[PDB]
């Protein structure tokens, strides 16, 4: 449910609320970053149809789009590197019910962005005999923006059980500024399931990249929002 967006520096960004009720009289907007505490940024009042901000924020930094029947939207201007984070809409039905939220990352230089390459590694013959379980490994390499969503699909259906993905990636170049990343994921299933050739396994990485509005001036292909994937079949 959580949405995600990658943007360049100096551009504007659009965020949509994900709440049980689309329209609320007062709708609040909070920002979360890894180190700092969550802070309220503003809240929209429908009766006065105006935004109420907090201290220390410019009046021409954020604004709101209020559709009659749709979920309200918040728009940010002049994106700075310190604006990266995750934004949540909130309301007060019984307590402060925060929405699914949306992640936002912004980058100064648009020539440093690369899409990830996805590879799938099949289980070892040693594990299949030592233990009755089988482990498939997914590796995504060479992506600069840490804005990816990884999923596993078995027989055409997304699987949530027996799958582990580390919460944070590692730097491909540990000492270089604006360095590319790498991420790993693991799926474990019964050896009976893996030995069946009928079963199809796929690792899908949703990469959040440039939009159609962004202009590309490089020899490489456009790092557009895409889905990279790798697949494998059962092998007795």
């Amino acid at each position: 449910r959580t949405k995600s967006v990658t943007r360049p520096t100096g551009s504007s960004a659009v965020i949509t609320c994900d709440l049980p009720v689309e329209n609320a009289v007062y709708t609040h907007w909070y920002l979360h970053q890894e180190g700092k505490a969550p802070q309220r940024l503003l809240y929209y009042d429908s009766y006065n149809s105006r935004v109420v901000l907090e201290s220390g924020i410019s009046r021409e930094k954020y604004h709101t789009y209020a559709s009659t029947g749709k979920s309200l939207k918040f728009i940010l201007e002049n994106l700075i590197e310190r604006d990266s984070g995750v934004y949540y809409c909130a309301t007060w039905d019984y307590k402060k019910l925060f929405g699914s939220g949306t992640t936002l990352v912004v980058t100064e230089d648009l020539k440093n962005v690369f899409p990830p390459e996805v590879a799938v590694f099949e289980p070892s013959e040693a594990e299949i005999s030592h233990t009755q379980k089988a482990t498939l490994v997914c590796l995504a390499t060479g992506f600069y923006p840490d804005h990816v969503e990884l999923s596993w699909w078995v027989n055409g259906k997304e699987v949530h059980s027996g799958v582990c993905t580390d919460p944070q990636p590692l730097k491909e170049q540990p000492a270089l500024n604006d360095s590319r990343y790498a991420l790993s994921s693991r799926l474990r299933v019964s050896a009976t399931f893996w030995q069946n050739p009928r079963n199809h396994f796929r690792c899908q990485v949703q990469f959040y990249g440039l939009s159609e509005n962004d202009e590309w001036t490089q020899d490489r292909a456009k790092p557009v929002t895409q889905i990279v994937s790798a697949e494998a079949w059962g092998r007795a």
């Binding site: 009766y47 006065n48 039905d93 019984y94």
Partner: protein, 263 residues
């Protein structure tokens, strides 16, 4: 750690004396009026300055509109009740809603409707139901209970909004609401045989307990109590009444404190 209570009262009367209005609504934070709206002014305005200091005008605008609608609904409801009861002339219709935070820790919420001062319909927030006292009230119970969403709205307001409203109100007027003024206790002598009066006066929190006891032993309900009344300056007062040579003491408990006066 004291029982505070937010309440809203609405009252209507059919064919009243032309001096008396037709509909009136008044709020209470600690039994002293906080707000007032009537059909003559058709405007909700505060009756306490500190509440007006900390509230935006749009609140008054919204609730003025809502109370206009509620006045119209109140009038039509009273007319329907008169039609059902075959009552002609002048009768009364009252509604009381609100919540209480008690000193023992428990919290309560209530919403009741009364006709001619007699109980007509009481809400049950835990059962989300209506207890009716009559078949005429049973008809209204059946009509209202159909709207589940409105009943859930009332219950959630009584359990999540009224308490919050009290929480902000007790801080907006903390000087006038959370203040404490100690009482002044005096003993009076004075038809052949007379008793000694124990009197307290000048306490803002109306919670007061008074007892007589001789050398640590209380009296067996022979203490003729007296009613508690307000002084008019924002304080209250009370009195109590209880030959042989016996020593007696008057014990009085106010908010937080127990004090004894000896003879």
């Amino acid at each position: 750690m004291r029982t505070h209570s937010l309440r809203y009262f609405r009252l209507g009367v059919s064919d009243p004396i032309h001096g008396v209005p037709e509909f009136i609504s008044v709020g209470y934070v600690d039994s002293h009026p906080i707000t007032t709206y009537d059909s003559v002014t058709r405007q909700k305005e505060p009756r306490a300055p500190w509440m007006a200091e900390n509230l935006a005008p749009d609140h008054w605008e919204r609730y003025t509109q809502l109370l206009r609608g509620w006045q119209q609904m109140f009038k039509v409801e009273l007319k329907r009740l008169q039609r059902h009861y075959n009552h002609s002339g002048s009768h009364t219709y009252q509604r009381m809603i609100g919540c209480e935070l008690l000193e023992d820790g428990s919290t309560t919420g209530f919403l009741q409707y009364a006709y001619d001062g007699q109980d007509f319909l009481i809400f049950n927030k835990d059962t989300l139901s209506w207890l009716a006292v009559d078949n005429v009230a049973h008809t209204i119970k059946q009509a209202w209970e159909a709207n589940q969403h409105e009943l859930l709205y009332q219950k959630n307001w009584l359990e999540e909004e009224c308490i919050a409203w009290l929480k902000r109100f007790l801080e907006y007027g903390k000087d006038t609401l959370q203040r404490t003024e100690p009482p002044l206790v005096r003993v009076n002598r004075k038809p052949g045989v007379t008793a000694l009066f124990c009197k307290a006066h000048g306490f803002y929190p109306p919670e007061i307990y008074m007892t007589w006891m001789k050398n640590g032993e209380e009296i067996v309900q022979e203490i003729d109590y007296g009613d508690i009344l307000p002084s008019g300056d924002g304080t209250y007062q009370a009195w109590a009444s209880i030959q042989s040579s016996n020593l007696y003491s008057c014990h009085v408990e106010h908010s937080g404190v127990h004090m004894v006066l000896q003879v």
